[PDB]
Symmetry: C2
Subunit: 220 residues, 2 copies
């Protein structure tokens, strides 16, 4: 049966450019266009949610120039998705981002929130550790304020406090050939089927998605 | 280079028996002998830690008879590992286990704790959710008792409170063909390389381990 929620680690944009002797911006520029395409194909197949990893909390360790390029490119979010009919949410630590990107995110969420087709969750300055830590801080604050006791700390409470929520990913696709989750949705991937492909993200098409979904369906 | 810490999801014992028309106890009986063999091969290759998933918090949902068989079989832990020279620790919720198994675990840990070769961590009545929840409860208790403030909640604090500790797995091997982590070491697997094999756990040998390690080394 068709996965309701797919998680996507969009790796290989760098590499794609480097392998060809092009500068890394050439690879990064495929990010939103390819994600848009994947959203279009996915909603036709009936997939209801995509959580896509655009920028890790660890990606701040890249060269300043690259990071600055990415943060500027990410402001194309509005132009790319505002009129797509996709409902867009961002997860991750928004207040560490440039204010203009924060406004771009806030506007894109506001204008697409009424859309009732595919829901795209973009994980931008996100990590599994971060999500669990922020959820833990909120739980501690509630305990400090007499709103719950230690024995009320259960899976359902965390699911309420985490940024990536139930229903969790049925399938995770990671392009680019590495076989790690790389601090993506650690809590949420507990029972997710993993699918890894050597195919670089800019070369990942409908036939690659279909093949992953088929591989997923034949494991049932 | 050689992985210091391997995580093992020992799946396929059931299946192995069922595929042959034998009862499931016949498959389960391979668990400790095969794990012992894997420990012997692993310490010769210089691997320092193995965390092996023997019983999930979700495995209590199996037939009562099967669960009762497993809990009795697990008491063979002492006879299997006490004189092996492996240092043995159990992680998971020990106080939900039968008292005789709790005593068997406590004795096996006590008598092997001085051993300085390979460290075997057996995850028995364990799950990632459980580990994160118990760590969160301890953090909340410390906050309630004025021992820390919410902004002291960081990755290092969790690493102190979690049952499976740093250094985290370099490589995870899951036998039996399913491509999930199945609520194993969720926090600890953030950057772990995943290796999946269709080979059922009772058929998994030195050549299968070597091939996984080689596959791991060629991803560097």
């Amino acid at each position: 049966l068709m996965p309701k929620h797919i998680a996507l680690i969009m790796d290989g944009n760098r590499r794609w450019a480097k392998d060809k002797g092009l500068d890394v911006s050439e690879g990064h520029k495929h990010l939103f266009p390819k994600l848009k395409e994947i959203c279009d194909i996915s909603s036709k197949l009936g997939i209801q949610v995509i959580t896509a990893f655009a920028f890790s909390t660890e990606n701040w360790k890249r060269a300043k120039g690259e990071v600055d390029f990415l943060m500027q490119m990410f402001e194309e979010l509005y132009d790319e998705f505002s009129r797509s009919g996709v409902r867009v949410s961002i997860i991750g630590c928004k207040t560490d981002l440039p204010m203009t990107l924060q406004k771009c995110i806030a506007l894109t969420e506001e204008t697409t929130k009424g859309n009732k087709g595919l829901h795209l969750v973009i994980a931008l300055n996100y990590g599994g550790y971060y999500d669990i830590l922020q959820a833990t801080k909120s739980i501690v604050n509630k305990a400090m304020n007499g709103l719950l006791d230690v024995e009320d700390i259960n899976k359902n409470l965390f699911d309420q406090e985490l940024e990536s929520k139930c229903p969790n990913p049925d399938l995770l696709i990671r392009t680019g050939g590495d076989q790690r989750v790389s601090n993506f949705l650690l809590w949420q991937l507990a029972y997710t089927e993993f699918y890894f492909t050597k195919t670089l993200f800019p070369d990942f098409g409908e036939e690659d998605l279909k093949e992953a979904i088929i591989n997923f369906q034949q494991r049932h």
